[PDB]
Amino acid sequence: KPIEIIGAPFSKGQPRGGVEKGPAALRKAGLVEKLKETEYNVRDHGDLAFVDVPNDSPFQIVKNPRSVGKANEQLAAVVAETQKNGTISVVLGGDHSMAIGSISGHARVHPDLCVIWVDAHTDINTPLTTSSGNLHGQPVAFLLKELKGKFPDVPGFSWVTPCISAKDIVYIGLRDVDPGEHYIIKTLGIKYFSMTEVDKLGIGKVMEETFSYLLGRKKRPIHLSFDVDGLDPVFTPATGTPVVGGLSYREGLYITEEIYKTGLLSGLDIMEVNPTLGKTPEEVTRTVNTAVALTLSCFGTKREGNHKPETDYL
Amino acid sequence: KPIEIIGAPFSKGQPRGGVEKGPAALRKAGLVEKLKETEYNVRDHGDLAFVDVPNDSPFQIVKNPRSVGKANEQLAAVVAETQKNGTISVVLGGDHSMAIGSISGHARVHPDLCVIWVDAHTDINTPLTTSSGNLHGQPVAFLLKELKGKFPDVPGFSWVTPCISAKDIVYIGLRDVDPGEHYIIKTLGIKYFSMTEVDKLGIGKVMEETFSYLLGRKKRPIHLSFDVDGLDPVFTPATGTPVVGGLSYREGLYITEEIYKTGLLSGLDIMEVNPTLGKTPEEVTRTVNTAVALTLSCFGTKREGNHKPETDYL
Amino acid sequence: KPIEIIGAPFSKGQPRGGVEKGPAALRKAGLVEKLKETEYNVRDHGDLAFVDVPNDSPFQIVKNPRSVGKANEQLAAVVAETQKNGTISVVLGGDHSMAIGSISGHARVHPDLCVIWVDAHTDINTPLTTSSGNLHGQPVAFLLKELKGKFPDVPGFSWVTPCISAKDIVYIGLRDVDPGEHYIIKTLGIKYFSMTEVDKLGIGKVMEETFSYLLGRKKRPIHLSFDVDGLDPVFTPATGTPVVGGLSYREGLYITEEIYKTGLLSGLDIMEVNPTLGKTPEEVTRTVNTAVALTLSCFGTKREGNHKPETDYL
Numbered sequence: 003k004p005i006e007i008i009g010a011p012f013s014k015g016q017p018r019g020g021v022e023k024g025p026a027a028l029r030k031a032g033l034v035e036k037l038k039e040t041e042y043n044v045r046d047h048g049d050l051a052f053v054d055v056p057n058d059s060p061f062q063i064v065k066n067p068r069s070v071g072k073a074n075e076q077l078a079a080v081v082a083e084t085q086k087n088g089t090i091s092v093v094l095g096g097d098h099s100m101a102i103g104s105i106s107g108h109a110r111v112h113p114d115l116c117v118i119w120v121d122a123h124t125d126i127n128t129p130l131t132t133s134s135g136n137l138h139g140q141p142v143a144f145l146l147k148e149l150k151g152k153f154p155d156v157p158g159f160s161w162v163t164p165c166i167s168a169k170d171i172v173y174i175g176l177r178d179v180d181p182g183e184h185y186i187i188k189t190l191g192i193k194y195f196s197m198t199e200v201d202k203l204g205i206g207k208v209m210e211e212t213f214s215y216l217l218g219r220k221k222r223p224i225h226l227s228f229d230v231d232g233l234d235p236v237f238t239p240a241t242g243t244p245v246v247g248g249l250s251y252r253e254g255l256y257i258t259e260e261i262y263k264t265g266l267l268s269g270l271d272i273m274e275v276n277p278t279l280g281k282t283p284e285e286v287t288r289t290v291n292t293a294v295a296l297t298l299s300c301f302g303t304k305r306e307g308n309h310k311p312e313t314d315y316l
Numbered sequence: 317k318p319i320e321i322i323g324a325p326f327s328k329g330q331p332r333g334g335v336e337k338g339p340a341a342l343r344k345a346g347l348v349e350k351l352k353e354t355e356y357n358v359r360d361h362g363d364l365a366f367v368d369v370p371n372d373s374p375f376q377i378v379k380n381p382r383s384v385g386k387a388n389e390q391l392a393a394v395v396a397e398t399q400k401n402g403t404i405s406v407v408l409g410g411d412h413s414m415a416i417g418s419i420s421g422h423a424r425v426h427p428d429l430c431v432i433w434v435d436a437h438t439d440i441n442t443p444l445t446t447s448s449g450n451l452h453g454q455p456v457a458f459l460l461k462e463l464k465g466k467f468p469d470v471p472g473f474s475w476v477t478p479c480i481s482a483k484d485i486v487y488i489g490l491r492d493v494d495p496g497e498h499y500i501i502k503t504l505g506i507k508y509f510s511m512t513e514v515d516k517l518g519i520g521k522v523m524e525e526t527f528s529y530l531l532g533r534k535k536r537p538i539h540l541s542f543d544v545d546g547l548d549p550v551f552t553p554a555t556g557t558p559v560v561g562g563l564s565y566r567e568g569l570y571i572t573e574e575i576y577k578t579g580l581l582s583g584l585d586i587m588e589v590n591p592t593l594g595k596t597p598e599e600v601t602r603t604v605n606t607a608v609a610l611t612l613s614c615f616g617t618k619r620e621g622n623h624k625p626e627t628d629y630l
Numbered sequence: 631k632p633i634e635i636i637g638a639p640f641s642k643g644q645p646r647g648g649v650e651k652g653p654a655a656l657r658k659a660g661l662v663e664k665l666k667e668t669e670y671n672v673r674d675h676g677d678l679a680f681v682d683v684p685n686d687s688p689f690q691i692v693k694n695p696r697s698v699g700k701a702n703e704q705l706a707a708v709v710a711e712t713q714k715n716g717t718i719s720v721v722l723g724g725d726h727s728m729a730i731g732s733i734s735g736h737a738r739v740h741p742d743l744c745v746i747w748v749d750a751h752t753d754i755n756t757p758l759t760t761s762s763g764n765l766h767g768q769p770v771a772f773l774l775k776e777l778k779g780k781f782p783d784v785p786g787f788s789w790v791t792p793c794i795s796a797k798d799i800v801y802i803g804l805r806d807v808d809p810g811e812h813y814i815i816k817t818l819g820i821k822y823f824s825m826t827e828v829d830k831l832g833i834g835k836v837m838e839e840t841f842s843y844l845l846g847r848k849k850r851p852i853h854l855s856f857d858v859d860g861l862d863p864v865f866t867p868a869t870g871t872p873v874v875g876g877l878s879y880r881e882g883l884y885i886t887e888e889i890y891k892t893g894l895l896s897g898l899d900i901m902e903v904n905p906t907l908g909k910t911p912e913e914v915t916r917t918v919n920t921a922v923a924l925t926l927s928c929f930g931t932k933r934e935g936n937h938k939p940e941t942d943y944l
């Protein structure tokens with residue numbers, strides 16, 4: 003199988019500068035090289051260049067709507083293209099708003115996919131529910147069919163077509179949810195596993211359950227959208243929205259490994275890694291390193307070890 | 317439902333100064349305010365003023381017995397008063413010795429209550445088993461019926477009436493038990509979940525089991541007596557008896573949330589937070605903050621999010 | 631039962647200086663004294679003195695083969711001697727390469743023993759698979775019967791006799807395995823529980839399973855070879871091969887306690903504690919302290935508490 007890395011150095015989705023540098027940091031950490039060492043064929047598609055929409059006025063509260071919509075429209079395009087060719091897309095990005103694009107494009111080629119969202123937040127605020135004007139917190143809203151029309155059209159997202167329904171997505175790691183967001187997910191009956199459920203069940207049962215839930219009937223393509231703030235700050239401190247009591251490094255890797263074992267990994271998102279937000283270089287090295295780890299995990303690397311087939315090491 | 321916060325700035329239960337400042341710290345962290353944001357009606361009853369008993373001689377080994385017994389007798393009174401009115405008591409305190417009062421008063425109004433004790437210790441030493449005259453380590457002994465007479469009467473605790481038996485209390489988080497203490501709990505066949513049980517079962521099964529055990533037959537009122545040292549030092553470092561390998565922040569919240577879900581929370585104790593014992597302001601900010609969190613959890617705040625009823629955020 | 635502490639201040643098994651100081655550090659932490667406080671009879675056999683083999687040339691890649699083989703031959707001797715007498719051997723050592731000796735000697739007296747290997751690595755590289763001539767990474771290879779002849783004889787290990795087979799050993803905590811090592815363990819069908827299994831099952835089921843696997847049919851003696859890097863660097867930072875996302879302090883203790891409860895603890899190894907590798911004195915105090923704890927755990931100390939029999943504390 004083939005892998006196509008795609009940088010998405012974007013940051014207008016939120017108010018803290020730095021996330022754009024994410025892809026650079028990950029690459030610098032030897033993501034590509036390491037990935038190549040896997041049983042997969044890899045090709046770096048470089049970092050997309052986002053044209054900045056001059057005079058991007060704040061749609062009501064939402065900020066930089068046109069910049070975000072265009073950047074995403076450009077991504078969904080690049081993504082759909084590679085998916086078409088039958089290669090696994092890996093978007094290294096800035097903020098989580100780019101998920102809109104990454105997923106829209108993926109849906110185009112595999113309209114039946116499901117989405118596994120590991121984040122500490124739901125990012126399902128509609129332009130009508132956000133406190134901030136931050137789009138990195140509304141991604142899911144632009145992708146859910148059930149939310150269609152539930153909020154004004156947005157300057158630049160005209161091109162988006164609610165691809166998945168609330169029955170095809172599953173959260174994991176929720177711990178900081180806005181009232182509006184809770185309302186929604188409860189109303190649309192969206193499956194989820196907040197840290198309280200992870201606590202109760204254990205990452206073991208969690209994955210077991212999300213898999214039956216999303217792949218019980220039909221076996222569809224999987225889209226792993228990983229918000230790095232999904233892990234506890236102690237592992238991925240360099241992020242914009244650190245929230246305590248999150249997923250442990252192990253839990254993070256257990257997830258990525260099980261998804262590997264399904265063999266249904268079609269698309270992947272590694273978002274929110276902000277190099278500039280580390281209090282000590284260590285914090286940044288740490289954040290990045292596990293990001294890479296989660297990635298390699300997705301593509302094979304087991305914690306029990308791996309050996310090349312047909313080779314008698316003895 | 318109504319909530320009544322009660323400060324118990326007491327510290328004679330143990331040898332390290334600072335715990336009295338506990339309530340102030342918690343309030344300063346905006347405990348009251350936040351609580352108000354909950355679906356509950358809150359009223360701060362202020363910090364009780366404890367009259368210091370001059371020439372409080374050490375009964376054998378036990379220290380400051382009269383100061384402790386009077387402070388508690390004063391509390392049990394204030395507590396019984398609010399419980400009477402049908403409001404939920406929340407004792408913000410200094411050391412865990414004030415549990416005597418908090419519980420005695422609570423029993424008066426609900427003699428059928430059960431007690432969930434999250435602590436790293438048992439605090440069940442009788443004045444005959446303590447190494448240190450510290451009363452903060454003997455609370456349970458003064459409350460257990462089965463221990464009645466098993467130790468000399470104590471200067472000031474005359475007014476106490478062993479309210480609950482060993483069949484109505486359950487420990488959670490034990491990890492530093494004195495030989496005398498182990499003898500007792502094993503002899504009185506008291507239900508408990510030490511870190512080794514939590515490790516074996518998982519906080520999931522733990523809560524499940526303590527609930528069946530204490531609420532299987534009849535549904536009674538719940539009294540949560542939370543010793544802050546129940547969580548690993550890494551979360552609540554600012555305490556007098558830090559003991560490694562304790563309850564994780566998550567585990568702590570899971571507990572408080574399940575108890576919320578029973579709807580049987582009648583009384584609550586937030587003890588041992590000592591602001592002065594933090595090596596770095598962070599350690600104190602950290603300790604306090606999660607204390608508040610455990611509190612808000614008890615009263616609703618879910619990690620999955622919360623939304624106000626009858627409001628269409630859409 | 632009797633306990634015999636044996637220091638093995640060795641370090642030629644690997645390239646970082648300091649591990650020889652391990653025993654000193656552990657003793658200085660009051661290991662002996664504390665052990666004495668247990669229901670066990672203890673005797674310190676002091677630290678063996680290892681004669682350095684001059685002009686120890688690198689057998690191909692392997693480094694200091696003769697120094698290592700001799701030091702081990704000297705240990706297996708000292709060990710076999712105490713085992714003979716019917717006392718439990720506790721090897722406090724430098725690097726994990728001394729496991730060769732500790733186990734060989736133990737096998738002599740109890741050829742039916744089983745080995746529980748808690749380490750973050752497998753240390754099963756044959757002199758033909760190692761990237762680094764480091765012997766501390768090949769211990770298991772010199773002990774497995776199934777590996778006999780699968781690699782050239784080594785200058786000084788002539789005296790070793792593959793005592794156990796792949797059906798009598800069980801790993802716990804694996805997370806950094808070399809390709810060669812993975813090949814082997816997969817080829818020899820060796821039972822193991824890498825962190826991913828621990829994640830799936832929980833330390834509870836893990837121990838339960840390893841016990842049924844190794845003690846299902848016959849009840850044999852247990853040899854606990856504990857590599858300190860088995861625990862996450864956040865607990866035992868002072869080691870040469872720190873690897874993230876490892877065994878939690880609790881998990882570590884849970885293991886040692888269960889093995890205590892089988893009553894089949896015959897031999898024990900506390901390896902890799904390197905006092906000189908701590909970034910801050912705290913890291914070293916921390917590493918050592920838990921080492922001691924895992925030890926006392928093996929010999930009784932429960933997290934739920936312990937009380938002396940026949941004594942009425944009341």
Ligand SMILES: CC(C)[C@H](N)C(=O)O
Binds near residue numbers: 125134136138
């Ligand atoms: C980013 C997220 C935590 C949040 N929903 C917001 O308002 O941006």
Ligand SMILES: CC(C)[C@H](N)C(=O)O
Binds near residue numbers: 446
């Ligand atoms: C406080 C507690 C750990 C202990 N039982 C004592 O003697 O005070």
Ligand SMILES: CC(C)[C@H](N)C(=O)O
Binds near residue numbers: 751755761766871
């Ligand atoms: C030490 C270990 C991690 C490794 N197998 C080596 O080559 O030394």
Ligand SMILES: [Mn+2]
Binds near residue numbers: 121123138229
């Ligand atoms: Mn996000």
Ligand SMILES: [Mn+2]
Binds near residue numbers: 121123229231232243
């Ligand atoms: Mn997030």
Ligand SMILES: [Mn+2]
Binds near residue numbers: 412435437439452543
């Ligand atoms: Mn206590």
Ligand SMILES: [Mn+2]
Binds near residue numbers: 436
């Ligand atoms: Mn305590």
Ligand SMILES: [Mn+2]
Binds near residue numbers: 726751753766857
């Ligand atoms: Mn080792």
Ligand SMILES: [Mn+2]
Binds near residue numbers: 749751859860871
């Ligand atoms: Mn190791």
